[PDB]
Every structure is written in structure tokens, then in C-alpha cells.
């Protein structure tokens, strides 16, 4: 191992830090893991496959142009460089090392592809064709896009894209499962909640949030219970940003938002896969929960869950640690197959009023093949109507007492549509025993005489059966 000689590597503070305020990537590199043999694809507005810092790692097999239906994902050039987003993401994962150009990718020996799919009508079929591309060749998919971050949208994958996610994790990588890495959202200033985004909220995606250089919650950051972990990204004007490849064969030091966080996570995951190619899609999420560090990340809502892990709605389980990920991957025993336990809670619709609480004691399918004693994800599938959606706040409390915020108030969301069988997801009770009393809390956070009705509450538990912790 030799540290990279690239001109901008020193400006890659999130990799080259000696402050002990970084992603601990060098420790992985020195263990001999640089992403060799791993294939990552950027689903975005294209990839400049001829970029001096990408050409060497470019993989046409990991690439396709879904918008124009050809094998060439080259970005469409315009005056204002609108289609630069994919190229910037790609360099974070796999910019070439030691070539005297720009900086380096987290997995600088990985192969990198791009799917051009945002530069056209983004239909359900377009999404499905991107998520489902060459899944026995592409290991990891990085997506830094989603529903509008205006703080009033509720939207997720339609039927074909949902089907592609499931096929991905069921069939991808010879059955080990495609790894889908997602940016959690940039709606912070609109107080958006990333549980209103069905891509980030999916159990099939690893949703990644951002932290600023000084360890703060960035202005653009969305809080929610579905986020799994965090990587560094851009912050205030006094804080450094992300250094990566730009359109027209340039180098930028100004890459920003959660779009910068998801690819750094994909690169760390690529290192991790090289250390253990047998890891399943669920193995990868376990490793993230086990190794991510709260330390030096500042938030107002750090809480200890039922198995003693610190969790935040801003950061999930905290900062990814490349060294720790790879170290644990090497000795990781694959987890048992996923079980899914479904519990219908309501016998009658419930008036919501100022505060509604619904309590149910569950056995988590005791005595059945889908019995779960060790939780992974949990969903509350809710159907409700309300006069002003954004004034609702919704919490879910596990039997071991872990309180997940399924929805915080969204001041811009004045919709009258309520929620139609919407699955709110939490990662915060991972590894807890889910048997016992769950509590759903729904409250009107406004003084106004708001009103409505909860007509369905389905509790969905995912996990395995195992020993006592």
C-alpha cells in the first residue's frame, strides 16, 4: 500500500484526514482492499465514460442508456452543464488513482458503469430497466435521485420498479441479492421527511444521509426512521465539500448534498464486498448496523435502542467506517433467510383527534414458520385521512421501548390526501426481540381543529429466529 499521489487527494478530507474525522478508508486500503473485482453502476443522467479519471475503470457491461435505448450512457451536453450529476457521483466511487489527475475514488480499483435514465421521461418502466440492469454483473447500484424534495410529496416506486427491486434482491448476484444504495434526500430546508420517499423508505435500499465536515446535520438533511447510516458531505460556507470528476473532463471541489453521500457509501460497500464476496444484501445491512460510529456526529436526538446501539433520525446508526466494515466482513457468518410476519391491528376505524394511540401485544408469529425473535426492519402500513396531512406526527414504540419517529410534522404539506396503505419503515429496532406490546402514536401538532380517521394499521416485521442477546 502507498497512499495516492493524485493532485487533489489532499483536498479529499473525508478520505485523507489525519484528524480522525473521516470515513477510515485508508485502513481498508492498507488491508489490501481497493475494490478489485467489484462492479458498481450509477443510475443518473449519464456518465462521461471518456473522462481522464474514469476511462481506466469504465465498464460498458455495467452501463446502458435507458432514455435513448442504446448501450452508450454519455451525458447530453448543454450550455449550463445540466447533465453533470452522474459523472460527479461516479468519480466518488471509482475515480482512477495514481494517474496525476484530480483525486481518487473510494474503490479506485473497482469498475464503474452508468445508466443514463434521468434525462428523459422517468416512467415506471424506465426505473425498472435501470434497477434491473445486468444483475449478475453489476454488484452495487448507486441512486442519488428520488421524488421531489419540496416537503409535501408522498411518492415511491410503482409496480414495475417495485418488481425490479424484489427481483434484484431475490435473483441478483447469483441469488445473493443486488445492493441498492440510496441518497436520503435534500429537502431539509423544507423540513421534508425521508419516510415520505418510497425509494429511501424501502427495506431493499440502504438509505444514506450526510454529515458536514465539522460533524453537524447539514442544512439539506432530511430526518426519518428509515435511514441506515451516514457519510460526510458538504455543509456551510466555512466547510469543505466533495472533490470529484466533472463534465467536460474537469475536476470539481464543489460536489454537494446527499448525492455526494450515497456514492461514497457505495464505494465503501464495494470494498466490503471484495473482502467477502459471499455477503447477501441483508448481510451488508447487518454489517452497516454493527460497525457504524455515532462518535463525533452532533445531533439533538441520539437515543439508545433496545440492544444498546445509539440511533439518530438524522444519521441512522452513524458514520460508515470502511476499516471496520471490511474487518468484520472477513469473518462474517451469513444470516438466516428473511422471515416476514404480518399483523393486522385494527378491528374498527379510529378517530384521530388531538392524539391517537393504538396498542397491540404481538407474538411475532410464535409457533409458525415466520416466527421472528430478532428484528431487522419494521413497517407500519397506515391508511388514514386527515384535513391537513403535514400537521400529523406519527411515532412507533417497540416492546423494548425504542421510539421511532415514522413521520415528523411537514409544514409545507397541506395535502388532503392522507395516506393510502403507505409503509413507514424504521431501522431503529434492528436486533431487538419484537414480541410484546407495540404502540402507534398519531398526533395533531397544530392548534387548529384538525380532524380525520385511521382506517388501517398493519404491522410488518422482518427478521430471523435466533438466540437471546
Amino acid at each position: 500500500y502507498q497512499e495516492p499521489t493524485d493532485p487533489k487527494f489532499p483536498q479529499q478530507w473525508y478520505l485523507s484526514g489525519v484528524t480522525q474525522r473521516d470515513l477510515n478508508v485508508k485502513a481498508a486500503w492498507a488491508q489490501g482492499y481497493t475494490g478489485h473485482g467489484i462492479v458498481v453502476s450509477i443510475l443518473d443522467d449519464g456518465i462521461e465514460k471518456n473522462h481522464p479519471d474514469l476511462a481506466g475503470n469504465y465498464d460498458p457491461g455495467a452501463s446502458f442508456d435507458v432514455n435513448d435505448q442504446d448501450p452508450d450512457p454519455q451525458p447530453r451536453y448543454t450550455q449550463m452543464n445540466d447533465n453533470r450529476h452522474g459523472t460527479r457521483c461516479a468519480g466518488e466511487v471509482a475515480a482512477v488513482a495514481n494517474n496525476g489527475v484530480c483525486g481518487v475514488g473510494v474503490a479506485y480499483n473497482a469498475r464503474i458503469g452508468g445508466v443514463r435514465m434521468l434525462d428523459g421521461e422517468v416512467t415506471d418502466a424506465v426505473e425498472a430497466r435501470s434497477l434491473g440492469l445486468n444483475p449478475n454483473h453489476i454488484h452495487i447500484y448507486s441512486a442519488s435521485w428520488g421524488p421531489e424534495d419540496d416537503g409535501k410529496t408522498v411518492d415511491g416506486p410503482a409496480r414495475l420498479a417495485e418488481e425490479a427491486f424484489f427481483r434484484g434482491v431475490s435473483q441478483g448476484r447469483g441469488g445473493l441479492g443486488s445492493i441498492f444504495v440510496w441518497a436520503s434526500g435534500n429537502g431539509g430546508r423544507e423540513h421534508d421527511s425521508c419516510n415520505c420517499d418510497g425509494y429511501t423508505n424501502s427495506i431493499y435500499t440502504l438509505s444514506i444521509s450526510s454529515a458536514t465536515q465539522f460533524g453537524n446535520v447539514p442544512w439539506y438533511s432530511e430526518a426519518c426512521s428509515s435511514t441506515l447510516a451516514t457519510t460526510y458531505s458538504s455543509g456551510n460556507q466555512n466547510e469543505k465539500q466533495i472533490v470529484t470528476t466533472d463534465l467536460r473532463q474537469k475536476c470539481t471541489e464543489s460536489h454537494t448534498g446527499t448525492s455526494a453521500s450515497a456514492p461514497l457509501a457505495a464505494g465503501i460497500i464495494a470494498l466490503t464486498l471484495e473482502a467477502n464476496k459471499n455477503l447477501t444484501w441483508r448481510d451488508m445491512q447487518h454489517l452497516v448496523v454493527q460497525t457504524s460510529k455515532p462518535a463525533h456526529l452532533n445531533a439533538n436526538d441520539w437515543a439508545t435502542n433496545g440492544v444498546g446501539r445509539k440511533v439518530s433520525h438524522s444519521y441512522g446508526y452513524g458514520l460508515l467506517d470502511a476499516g471496520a466494515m471490511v474487518a468484520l466482513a472477513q469473518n462474517w457468518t451469513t444470516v438466516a433467510p428473511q422471515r416476514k410476519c404480518i399483523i393486522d391491528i385494527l378491528t374498527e376505524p379510529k378517530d384521530i383527534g388531538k392524539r391517537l394511540e393504538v396498542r397491540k401485544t404481538v407474538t411475532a408469529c410464535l409457533g409458525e414458520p415466520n416466527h421472528i425473535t430478532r428484528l431487522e426492519h419494521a413497517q407500519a402500513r397506515l391508511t388514514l385521512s386527515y384535513n391537513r396531512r403535514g400537521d400529523l406526527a406519527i411515532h412507533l414504540v417497540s416492546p423494548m421501548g425504542t421510539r421511532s419517529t415514522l413521520l415528523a410534522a411537514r409544514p409545507h404539506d397541506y395535502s388532503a390526501d392522507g395516506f393510502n396503505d403507505w409503509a413507514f419503515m424504521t431501522t431503529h429496532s434492528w436486533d431487538e426481540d419484537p414480541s410484546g406490546e407495540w404502540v402507534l402514536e398519531i398526533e395533531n401538532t397544530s392548534e387548529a381543529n384538525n380532524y380525520g380517521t385511521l382506517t388501517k394499521f398493519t404491522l410488518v416485521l422482518y427478521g430471523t429466529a435466533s438466540g437471546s442477546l
Partner: nanobody
Amino acid sequence: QVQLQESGGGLVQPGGSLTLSCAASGFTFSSYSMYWVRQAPGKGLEWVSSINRVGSNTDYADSVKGRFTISRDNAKNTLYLQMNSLKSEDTALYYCAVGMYAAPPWRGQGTQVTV
């Protein structure tokens, strides 16, 4: 048993007026907000109007604003929808419910209105 029964539907000349009724039985009517939703031929469900339990707050879809009036009589266990200046666009089966996405018995069988 829980029952919501809609009435007052029928044929009306465009620009006309109808008053819809919904009688409730089998549960405490005053325990729930109430909703009018409609389904038009070959179209998805559309929320029309809503009212809280005592009737002191009311809401309307943009398409019916200024034309419809929702009200309820809790003593008489009945919900109403007064419709004015009806258009062809208003032709649908009209449903009474305790929730926008409720299903029977918590949503009614409906009453057809035709313009």
C-alpha cells in the same frame, strides 16, 4: 350491524341542485369524522368533502368549492351534501364514509346522481 346508507340521488338538469343524505346505524355516529367521496365512470375515487365530528370544521375538494355544502345532524344520525350548480363533470356514484379510504361496512353502497 354497522350500516351507512346513501339516498337522495337521481337525475337532474345541469345547473340544478340536489341534496344527498346518509343515515348511519350500528355505531356512535358522533364518534367519527365523515366524508363524501365519489366514483365517476371509468375513473378512480375522488374525495369531495369532509366534516369533523361536531360539524365545526369542513373541507372541500377544489373542484366543488363554492358549489357544495356538507353538514351533519348528530341527533338524527345523518350526514348531508347540498350540491348546487351541478355540472356534467359531477355525474358519479356518491359514497358516504368515516374515512376517505374506508371500505364496507364503513363505506356505504352509494347513491347515483346523474347530470
